[PDB]
Each structure stands twice: as structure tokens, then as C-alpha cells.
């Protein structure tokens, strides 16, 4: 029962650095020129290219072990394509006037930079990451 962030980004770079399945994207945000994003993505399961336009929603719902099927016929809280799930080892840098946060997806890292998220994001593990089209 929740959601925490939403917006669409302008991928300005997709670096694969010696990896063969992962790339580090850095897409600017449509709207607010402040909001930025750096993220690790498994390209093998959701390719990405420069100038693309991704919609990024955080959320935190729809820890107990996990089951595979059944739900695939039920709570399809996946109105997206790419779907990760990491933890917030978030260093609220409290840089200058903006506030950046960090997430860890099994090692695939992510970092948002804004300011109005003070009442938006968590300060605790649990947090899914969704992206569509």
C-alpha cells in the first residue's frame, strides 16, 4: 500500500565499462532541471540507449520467503517492464541545498539527486524500482 517517486528521464549516457550485461546510465529529468539519476541496469533483460526516455517509479509495495507463480495470475502490481528491488544504504549527502539518496540492488547501484524528496523516500531497505518503455 504505497508509492514514493515518479518522473521520466532523459538518458544522456549509457556506459558498459568492461561488463557484458550491465551498464551505468545517467539520465537527466524532464521538468525539474535539478533532479538527476545514475543507475546500473541489466541491459540483457532491458536494453537502453542514449537519448531514450525512461519513466522511473520507486514505490515500496505490491520479509517472508517469495514465491514464484500464482501471483503472476494475481497481484500484477507490475504495470512496468524492468523491476528491481534493493536496499537503501542511503547517504543523505545533504549536499549544498539538494538531497541525494542511494539504493543497492544486489550490487547494482542507484543514486537520485533532488530536494523535495524529504517526505518522499525511505531511510530503510525495502524499496522496489520500476521502469517502463
Amino acid at each position: 500500500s504505497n508509492t514514493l517517486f515518479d518522473d521520466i528521464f532523459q538518458v544522456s549516457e549509457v556506459d558498459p565499462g568492461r561488463y557484458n550485461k550491465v551498464c551505468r546510465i545517467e539520465a537527466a529529468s524532464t521538468t525539474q532541471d535539478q533532479c538527476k539519476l545514475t543507475l546500473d541496469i541489466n541491459v540483457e533483460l532491458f536494453p537502453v540507449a542514449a537519448q531514450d526516455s525512461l519513466t522511473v517509479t520507486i514505490a515500496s509495495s505490491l520479509t517472508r520467503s517469495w514465491r514464484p507463480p500464482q501471483a503472476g495470475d494475481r497481484s500484477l502490481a507490475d504495470d512496468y517492464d524492468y523491476v528491481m528491488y534493493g536496499t537503501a544504504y542511503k547517504f543523505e549527502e545533504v549536499s549544498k541545498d539538494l538531497i541525494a539518496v542511494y539504493y543497492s540492488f544486489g550490487g547494482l547501484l542507484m543514486r537520485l539527486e533532488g530536494n523535495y524528496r524529504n517526505l518522499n523516500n525511505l531511510k530503510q531497505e525495502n524499496a522496489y524500482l520500476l521502469i517502463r518503455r
Binding site: 565499462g17 568492461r18 561488463y19 557484458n20 550485461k21 550491465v22 551505468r24 545514475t38 546500473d40 541489466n42 533483460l45 532491458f46 520479509t63 517472508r64 520467503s65 517469495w66 514464484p68 507490475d78 512496468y80 517492464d81 524492468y82 523491476v83 528491481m84 528491488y85 534493493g86 536496499t87 544504504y89 547517504f91 543523505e92 542511494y102 543497492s104 540492488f105 544486489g106 550490487g107 547494482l108 547501484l109 543514486r111 531511510k123 522496489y128
Partner: protein, 773 residues
């Protein structure tokens, strides 16, 4: 005297050893045939009448058996020959000499044993085939391999004797050793190579294989961790599963060259609550390194949990490696076509520099360097040129090799490998040398009859241009063999000399022990150290820590520690502290804060005198930074709200704690001073770590977390004091001799030759030097 030399070695066996990925760190596989030979006398008691009665029935030929039953009268009934072997009625108080069984504590040892860690206690695991089996990580403390090594197993014979082994010698209690205040056991070879390949970002595991991996970790809790990727494919991270082998409450932070909180290179290491958040896992994290994962798990969870840790990790990685595979072939030693050309030119450039200096010398234009001969300095430059070549040639090959290159994969993980190796295999082998010089003119004015007289070129005097891959010319081959023989000869020497030095050191210190007064004395009762190690601490409880007070500019020192309640700018902002606003301009508190600052400034002076160098990292007990990282995780301290700590809380709190870090207790004046001295360095670390601004601005501790930090520091500290009865002398001798049995190879005297020269107090040194400033 024939018995004062250990001959009649009863109750022990010896055999070839083999490695075993499925044994726990502290076990030893004992072949059934050897188990039936070694016995332990166990008194018949109601707690064990059945087991014994059963063993006696199995007899001397079936494993859970026994060899003799001894009755009250001391009579010995031989179960192998005896008309009543199968008709015995044990009675309380009798003794049954049973075979050693699973879990008995036994002493395992590999000679030459010049380490206490070369004689540890293990738990028995009776197994089939002959040969003893060991967990791979118990390998280095024994300095053992499996190309034929043999080890001895001794069976403790009494009850107090069993206890001594398992309570003092057991492998787990030796993970962290005092010889170098760090673990002496870590993850190696296959498991090391595998753990790295498993931790890369590109490594993902599918559901089918994840469930197996999970199930392989015995301390797992049937809770399938949610995938790092849920999208079109439930995929798990390699880091995710390894994290299951690490227990809860483990935190770890380390920054490498260019590591950030986004470490692009997947550099560094960041584990939080037993979940690796970022960084590839290799030798710096899982090796026997200082602050690594094993040092931490031990100190934080205790010896047993750490021992189990080696096995859990081994089982996961070894499984992930069995199904991933790893290999190496000739292919891995082949460098890029263009690279080889860059290499040939690099060497060709070296032969020119050498050719020039020769023409120079032949015209008589070279100037000798003071206190040196023309020929001496000539040789010098030629050798510098030729090594510069081998080296730069080697770097060109190293850079080339891709991340697929198996040789490079092993080097990146930490498991066997090194530049020099890749350099000699792929690029130039280099200059040979005997007695520190190039190959000498053994024939009149020439190295081999194949050259002309007076030929000082690199090919003549021993430079091997080819790599091992290319092969050596015959002349290169012979020169490389001349150099080779040298190493074989003195390897024999170094060996012999070190073994006698080690036995002389032990003999000189054997009787030195730590008494109950914390004094270190010899058999006579003479004082050697008025307090062991000048600090009363046990070396296995010491860690390298950074004494901040000592580094950087003064502006920085002041920005960091200065708290001026009487200045709008240099006060504690009311957001870091609850009572922040009403503290502004508080005269009485400011008096407390000035005492704290004057003390911090004295400390800095003091430290700068002791470590005139400027060095800040020194081994000290109680790892404060770790204690604080724990507090912040334990009390989920939010870095957003202001703390409820008072300035009196901190200042007076830290002040009180210092009066509790006790090494000595005597009530008189002398001892109390000795006590203040012994705790001086640690207290400087303490005061700089718990300075008011630091506690509120950096750590953000709440009154609860803070009070927790203070009591932990006291607990750990007291747990770090050395125990009276410590055979510190033998400990010392062995700690110096053991590594001196590892030295093998700018013009002075080092290595064993110099060490022997020292211990001998020779009035005729070989290299009497003076250094004048």
C-alpha cells in the same frame, strides 16, 4: 635423557594429508584404520554405560569399538583374545579403552613446528580411505600442501588434558594470532578465485541454482531472499547469495583508490547487517587481511561462529565454482601481436642505451661516481637499463591481457600470481646474476667460448631477452641455470641457518612469563618488562587504528574539534543537538568545552613527539570505529533529527570512562602512575574519537547509543588485557623465528645473515655503516 627427547610417542599416528572442501575448519578426517588403533580410556559411568557396553561388543575390529576393558583391580581384559570378549558386564568405575570417535579433541601437528599454530586441536571425523584430511583454510598456519606432506595426530589421554586442548589449542581460538595482531587463517585458492567471479556485477543466478546454493549453507533459515531483479525474470545477484553465508550484525567499510558511494569500478567493500551492498569480494575482504571480514566476524561474533563462517563460504562458492568452472592454458600467456612488437622495441631501446654507455666508456668519457670505479658505475648503469627494460616490457604485457585472461583472473583475486611471473612468461625473462653481478668471465675474458674476448654486451654477460613462452637460446639457458643454481644453494643455507636461529631464540626466552602483577619476568624472578609490551595488552587483541589528532593542518584540527558556545559561528548548530539553542553563550559549559580542547591540543603535541614521522595508524586495542558503526545500526539512528545528548553527557562521560580502562589495580602512587602511562596512547585515540563535535556532528549518537558505546569500549578493553600465565617468551621467540623461515632472495646485509650477525652481537660486522645528517 633418552626419554627427555620425546621418543616413546604413544597414542599418535602419522600419514599423508589431503585437502577437503567438505570438512569444517576445526575438523580432521581420521581414516577408520587409524581410528581403530588409537584409544581413549573412558571411565564407566551411568551417563555412558550403554554407549560403552555397545562399543565393547563391537570389539577391536569394528569402528565404534574398544580394545580393552579394565576392572577395579586394575586388571586388563584384552578384547581381541579373550573367551569372554562378547560376555562382559561393565560396572561403574571401570574403564573402557575405546577407539577415538567423532568429536574427540585431538592434537594435529606438522613439522617442523616453529609456530604454536602448527600444533592445534581438532575435532575427529572418522572417514574411509587412508590419509588425514584438512579444511583448506587451515593450510597456511601449518605451512602445508598436498604433494606428499605428512602430519602427526596425538590423542589426549586424560579428562583435564582433553579440556586443555579444546579450551586453549582448538583451531577456532587461533584464527586471530598474536604474532602479527591479525588472522593467520583466510579463504584461499579455489574459493578465492571463485568468490571474485561470483561477486562481479555481471554475475546473476537463476532460481533453480539459487535454491541449491541456499540449501548448501547449513545455517540457512529457509527464507528465500527476494530477487535483486523481479522484472521479466526472477534473477538473483551473486552478491546476494554470498551474503547469506555472512551472519547478521556484520558491518564493513573500506575505500580503495577511487571508491565512492557509487564505486563505478565496483571497488572497495561495503557490508551492512550481513548484506554486501557493493564491491567485488576478493583477498582484501576475505583473505587473512587486517580489518577484513574474518577479523571482524571473529571479534564480533566469537571464534566458533567465525570457524563456521569459513565452511559456509567455502560450500557456497565451491558449489558455484563447480558449475561455472575455471581453467588456464598456453593461450593465457600469449600477448597481443602489436603488444609483442611494442615489447621487442622496448628491449631494443634498452640495448641502445647500453651500447652508448659502452662507446662512452671505451672513449673514456664516463665519469666515475664518487667512491666508485669506472667499471663499477658502468655495470651499475647497464644493469639499471636492463631491469628498466624487463620491467617496462612486463607492464606492456600486463596491461594487454583482458579480464578473460585466466592468469589475470587469478592475480586479481589474490590467489597465486604476481607481475614478475606474468612478465617472465609473456615478455622478457630478464637479467641473470650470480653474487649480485652479471655473469662473470669464467673463461679468460669471456663468459662462454662462443663469444669474443672483452665483450660486455647484454647478450654476453647474461641478459635473457626471451620470455618462457618463446624459449631460451642455449647461451640464455646456461646463464639462467647459473643464476638458478645460486638460489638452490643458498635456499639450502637459509634453510639450515634459520632452523638453528629459531632454536636459539626459543632457548633464550623460554622462561619468560606474565605474572599476576602484569610484570614480565624470567625464572629467577627478575623484571624484564615492568608491564608486558609496555601496555599490558595481548597482541591477539590489537588492531591498526588511525590517531586522527595527529594529521593535517591546524585549521582542519580546529574545524573538527573546536566548540565555542560563545560564538554564533563556531558553536554547535541547534540541529545537531536538542538543547542546541539554549546552549549558545553558556559560560559554565564553555569551561568544560575548553578543558576538552586544551586536552586535544596537548594530545596532538604529544603524539607528534612520539611519532616524529607523522604516522597515524598504530595497532591499539578496541576498534572504536567499529563499535560506533555498530551503535548506529543497532539503534537505527536517523541522521535527520537532533540528538538528545547533553554536553555534560559527552565530556563528563568520556572523562569517567577513562578512569575505568584498567590494566593495573594496585592502590599506591607508583602503580597508579604506571596505570596512567600504560593507558596513555589509547586514551588519546579515545578522546579524539569521542570529542563533542565528533559525537554530535559526525556520529549523531543519541543518549542511548552513546551510553552503549562507552560500556562496550570498557568491556572490549578489559577483554584485551593479557592473561597472567602467558608464555610470552616462547611466544616471542617463535613470532620472530617463524617468519625468518620465509626470507629468500641496496648494498648492505639483510636476511638471515644479518639476523645471525645481530643475535651473535658480532664485533666484526660485514657492513659497518654510519648515517650522518
Amino acid at each position: 635423557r633418552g626419554n627427555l627427547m620425546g621418543k616413546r610417542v604413544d597414542f599418535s599416528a602419522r600419514t599423508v594429508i589431503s585437502g577437503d572442501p567438505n570438512l569444517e575448519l576445526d575438523q580432521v578426517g581420521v581414516p577408520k584404520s587409524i581410528a581403530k588403533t588409537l584409544t581413549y580410556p573412558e571411565v564407566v559411568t551411568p551417563y555412558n554405560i550403554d554407549r560403552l557396553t555397545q562399543l565393547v561388543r563391537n570389539g577391536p575390529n569394528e569402528h565404534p569399538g574398544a580394545k580393552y576393558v579394565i576392572r577395579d583391580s586394575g586388571d586388563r581384559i584384552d578384547l581381541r583374545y579373550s573367551k569372554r570378549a562378547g560376555d562382559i558386564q561393565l560396572q561403574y568405575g571401570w574403564k573402557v579403552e575405546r577407539h577415538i570417535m567423532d568429536n574427540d579433541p585431538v592434537l594435529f601437528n606438522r613439522q617442523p613446528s616453529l609456530h604454536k599454530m602448527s600444533m592445534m586441536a581438532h575435532r575427529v571425523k572418522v572417514i574411509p580411505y587412508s590419509t588425514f584430511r584438512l579444511n583448506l583454510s587451515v593450510t597456511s598456519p601449518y605451512n602445508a600442501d598436498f604433494d606428499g606432506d605428512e602430519m602427526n595426530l596425538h590423542v589426549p589421554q586424560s579428562e583435564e588434558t582433553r579440556a586443555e586442548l579444546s579450551q586453549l589449542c582448538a583451531v577456532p581460538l587461533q584464527i586471530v594470532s598474536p604474532q602479527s595482531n591479525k588472522p593467520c587463517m583466510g579463504i584461499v585458492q579455489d574459493t578465492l578465485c571463485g568468490i571474485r567471479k561470483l561477486t562481479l556485477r555481471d554475475t546473476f543466478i537463476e532460481l533453480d541454482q539459487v535454491l541449491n546454493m541456499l540449501y548448501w549453507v547449513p545455517d540457512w533459515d529457509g527464507v528465500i531472499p527476494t530477487p535483486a531483479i523481479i522484472k521479466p525474470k526472477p534473477l538473483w545477484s551473486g552478491k546476494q547469495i554470498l551474503s547469506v553465508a555472512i551472519p547478521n550484525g556484520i558491518h564493513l567499510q573500506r575505500f580503495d583508490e577511487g571508491t565512492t558511494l557509487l564505486s563505478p569500478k565496483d571497488n572497495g567493500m561495503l557490508i551492512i547487517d550481513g548484506q554486501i551492498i557493493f564491491g567485488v569480494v576478493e583477498k582484501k575482504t576475505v583473505g587473512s587481511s587486517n580489518g577484513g571480514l574474518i577479523h571482524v566476524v571473529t571479534r564480533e561474533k566469537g571464534p566458533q561462529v567465525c570457524a563456521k563462517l569459513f565452511g559456509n563460504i567455502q560450500k557456497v562458492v565451491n558449489f558455484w565454482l563447480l558449475h561455472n568452472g575455471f581453467s588456464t592454458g598456453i593461450g593465457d600467456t600469449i600477448a597481443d601481436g602489436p603488444t609483442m612488437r611494442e615489447i621487442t622495441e622496448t628491449i631494443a631501446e634498452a640495448k641502445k642505451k647500453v651500447l652508448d654507455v659502452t662507446k662512452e666508456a671505451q672513449a673514456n668519457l664516463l665519469t666515475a661516481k664518487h667512491g666508485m670505479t669506472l667499471r663499477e658505475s658502468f655495470e651499475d648503469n647497464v644493469v639499471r637499463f636492463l631491469n628498466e627494460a624487463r620491467d617496462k616490457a612486463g607492464r606492456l604485457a600486463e596491461v594487454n591481457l583482458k579480464d578473460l585472461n585466466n592468469v589475470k583472473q587469478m592475480v586479481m583475486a589474490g590467489s597465486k600470481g604476481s607481475f614478475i611471473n606474468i612478465a617472465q612468461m609473456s615478455a622478457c625473462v630478464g637479467q641473470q646474476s650470480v653474487e649480485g653481478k652479471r655473469i662473470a668471465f669464467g673463461f679468460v675474458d669471456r663468459t662462454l667460448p662462443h663469444f669474443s674476448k672483452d665483450d660486455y654486451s647484454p647478450e654476453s654477460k647474461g641478459f635473457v631477452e626471451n620470455s618462457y613462452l618463446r624459449g631460451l637460446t642455449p647461451q640464455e639457458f646456461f646463464f639462467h641455470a647459473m643464476g638458478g643454481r645460486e638460489g638452490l644453494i643458498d635456499t639450502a643455507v637459509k634453510t639450515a641457518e634459520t632452523g638453528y636461529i629459531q632454536r636459539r631464540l626459543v632457548k633464550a626466552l623460554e622462561d619468560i612469563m606474565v605474572h599476576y602483577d602484569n610484570t614480565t619476568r624470567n625464572s629467577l624472578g627478575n623484571v624484564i618488562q615492568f608491564i608486558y609490551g609496555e601496555d599490558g595488552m595481548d597482541a591477539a587483541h590489537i588492531e591498526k587504528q588511525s590517531l586522527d589528532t595527529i594529521g593535517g593542518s591546524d585549521a582542519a584540527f580546529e574545524k573538527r574539534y573546536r566548540v565555542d558556545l560563545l560564538n554564533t559561528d563556531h558553536t554547535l548548530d541547534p540541529s545537531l543537538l536538542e538543547s542546541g539553542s539554549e546552549i549558545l553563550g553558556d559560560l559554565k559549559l564553555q569551561v568544560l568545552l575548553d578543558e576538552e580542547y586544551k586536552q586535544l591540543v596537548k594530545d596532538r603535541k604529544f603524539l607528534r613527539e612520539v611519532f616524529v614521522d607523522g604516522e597515524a595508524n598504530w595497532p591499539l586495542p578496541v576498534n572504536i570505529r567499529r563499535i560506533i558503526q555498530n551503535a548506529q545500526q543497532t539503534f537505527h539512528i536517523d541522521h535527520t533529527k537532533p540528538s538528545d545528548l547533553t554536553i555534560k553527557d559527552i565530556v563528563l562521560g568520556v572523562k569517567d570512562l577513562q578512569e575505568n580502562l584498567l590494566v593495573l589495580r594496585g592502590k599506591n602512587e607508583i602503580i597508579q602512575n604506571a596505570q596512567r602511562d600504560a593507558v596513555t596512547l589509547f586514551c588519546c585515540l579515545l578522546r579524539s574519537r569521542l570529542a563533542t563535535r565528533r559525537v554530535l556532528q559526525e556520529y549523531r549518537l543519541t543518549k542511548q547509543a552513546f551510553d552503549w558505546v562507552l560500556s562496550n569500549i570498557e568491556a572490549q578493553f578489559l577483554r584485551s588485557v593479557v592473561h597472567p600465565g602467558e608464555m610470552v617468551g616462547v611466544l616471542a621467540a617463535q613470532s620472530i623465528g617463524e617468519p625468518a623461515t620465509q626470507m629468500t632472495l641496496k648494498k648492505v646485509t639483510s636476511g638471515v645473515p644479518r639476523l645471525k650477525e645481530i643475535l651473535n652481537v658480532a664485533k666484526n660486522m660485514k657492513t659497518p655503516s654510519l648515517t650522518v645528517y
